[PDB]
């Protein structure tokens, strides 16, 4: 059909083995910067001793640098604090003597080439956090609960506050943190104070009170605020770093419920609101571009009460595509997919040449169900969660089940080349997979109960595979290492030999497999989100289209480390479909027109009475966030008020 000829020769001289002799227990692997090849391995032992290795050739060869950390014991709760981008910043937390005045850290800012030692004025409680803006700025919590900041990459530490619960870096070196007054974090649960410092502990602005907790997501700063003389709380959103606050149009919750930021960006948020009483599911709400107005997107969305597992996934290889698991009335789990930012959810189309399993009532008609965080949690035979990379357009890889729900059977692997619109069985039985060279190479390793000595590769996006032997002595496979970003052609296989056992790492380079670099001819045109090509509006998702240039399945070549996904948008005309109901409006029947409510019930009346001037007055409609349509329809009607309609029933004081 189609395979690589004389491949065995091209890979043999490019297979680079490494034995990690004195290795057991812990095994931390950290990549340091992009286009560097710097990897750090950290093995800890318990009576203990710590070992540290460093590669500079993508894991092909390491050199023991335990000497650089004076062989001392390193705490793995803090792991390896690696700095942003290509700063080269690396921080290791050392375990210290019982009665010491403060902790100790090993800091390298030259890609682990040289480690300085530093004794701290406090005992750290959290892993130190690098300011996204400035790699030299760090923050940490002491075991005493004090917020310590550093401006010189952890050399000198200053205690900027003394009773902090949670602290986070914002954009432009801002620090947000909750503070308690009486007992502890647990005693003042819902009675904390949200503060902020733009001048690194110089000044402070109390941006919130009666605080339960806070979180950042995209352009937003969320904070859950406790109800006065009540056991409940609700969401409050600020988009100006705490200066102005607004109550989110969302249900309030009790103490046994939560709010989870499923996903957030520069346009909107996906918020999971927990269902009252141990149900193991909630409801997804999609926000407007202000993070204030919320549209109910998905019901009975599976998110566990203990452990907090959810199969909620962003199919990062196609714009507007997300998959998750819902809980059926009949207590079965089905996988749903949204192609339009959670506007509409539906089942995944089963692959053409696949039969329905025992879970399906009709042996002809059924769907594809994906195994993710939840299946894994239930100790099912799922070695990997769904995988997609933004640079490898349309490709989604996952362990699935074809039927009416997620089955307990041993899953085969499924691939989509168009962002989840159509599927096909990639491999049979569980595997571990990786996407090299922005979709140029897909790599697979079998999930076995006994040793393996083989790797499988594909140069046509999982349509055709090829077996390769990387070792004479088989290993008990553990996992795959590859450079974040899915741009390298360097894959590190990991595992341990048969015992008196020891860890090993074989790194295969695909430079010779893809000796030719891609040229203009190798790429083809591809309209993302196609359904009916006859249609003028075909591919319009969120008011616009995107046409891509994609490497041909046939074309086997290297996209290159500098590959730039080339796409062109087509601005479609506005329909009502590009608008969500603002506050006080609803879409009855099938109809796409936003009509005013007869009267506001539940959390809608709660907003109506305790909101603010801007959101309470409405155009009826609001443009869907991320929606970039032009022309066509527009909601033409005056910006009307509702603070009269709600209070109209309430007898008013004089
Ligand atoms: C789902 O994933 C996509 C792709 O990873 C996110 O989109 C990117 O967002 C960043 C934000 O800074 C942009 O600079 C990129 O241009 C976006 N990538 C692409 C390919 O569009 C998206 O935000 C994620 N969804 C949510 C809700 O966070
Ligand atoms: C795979 O690993 C090799 C190193 O083992 C990478 O080689 C680097 O290549 C760049 C140019 O592409 C050079 O500037 C570096 O000096 C090379 N480093 C070494 C140690 O040889 C190679 O880039 C990796 N392959 C891919 C596709 O990322
Ligand atoms: C701070 C903000 C705005 C994010 C809300 C806040 N959130 C949270 O406390 C919160 C709790 C849990 C959780 O996941 C789970 C983890 C384990 C088990 C079950 C669930 N995720 C988030 C709140 O509920 O008030």
UniProtKB/Swiss-Prot annotation:
PTM: The N-terminal propeptide is cleaved by furin and possibly other homologous proteases. Palmitoylated. Undergoes cysteine S-palmitoylation which promotes the partitioning of the receptor into an endosomal membrane subdomain where it can interact with the retromer cargo-selective complex which mediates its retrograde trafficking to the Golgi apparatus.
Keywords: Cell membrane, Cleavage on pair of basic residues, Developmental protein, Differentiation, Disulfide bond, Endocytosis, Endoplasmic reticulum, Endosome, Glycoprotein, Golgi apparatus, Lipoprotein, Lysosome, Membrane, Nucleus, Osteogenesis, Palmitate, Phosphoprotein, Receptor, Repeat, Signal, Transmembrane, Transmembrane helix, Transport
Membrane topology annotation: Single-pass type I membrane protein
Inducing or repressing factors: During osteoblast differentiation.
Main location group: Golgi
A GO CC annotation given for this chain: lysosomal membrane
UniProt repeat feature BNR, residue ranges: 53-64, 106-117, 148-159, 195-206, 236-247, 285-296, 336-347, 414-425, 456-467
Topological domains annotated Extracellular: 1-654
Disulfide bonds: 1-464, 165-185, 356-366, 518-557, 540-572, 574-629, 581-594, 608-646
A GO BP entry: protein targeting to lysosome
Source organism superkingdom: Eukaryota
Expression sites by tissue: Expressed in brain and prostate (at protein level). Expressed at high levels in brain, spinal cord, heart, skeletal muscle, thyroid, placenta and testis. Expressed at lower levels in lymphoid organs, kidney, colon and liver.
Location in or out of the cell: Golgi apparatus, Golgi stack membrane; Endosome membrane; Endoplasmic reticulum membrane; Nucleus membrane
Interactions with LRPAP1 and NGFB as annotated region, ranges: 518-654
Free-text comment about domains: The N-terminal propeptide may facilitate precursor transport within the Golgi stack. Intrachain binding of the N-terminal propeptide and the extracellular domain may also inhibit premature ligand binding.
Protein family: Belongs to the VPS10-related sortilin family. SORT1 subfamily.
Function field: Functions as a sorting receptor in the Golgi compartment and as a clearance receptor on the cell surface. Required for protein transport from the Golgi apparatus to the lysosomes by a pathway that is independent of the mannose-6-phosphate receptor (M6PR). Lysosomal proteins bind specifically to the receptor in the Golgi apparatus and the resulting receptor-ligand complex is transported to an acidic prelysosomal compartment where the low pH mediates the dissociation of the complex.
Entry protein name: Sortilin
Organism: Homo sapiens (Human)
Gene: SORT1
Full-sequence portion shown in this chain: 86 to 748 of 831
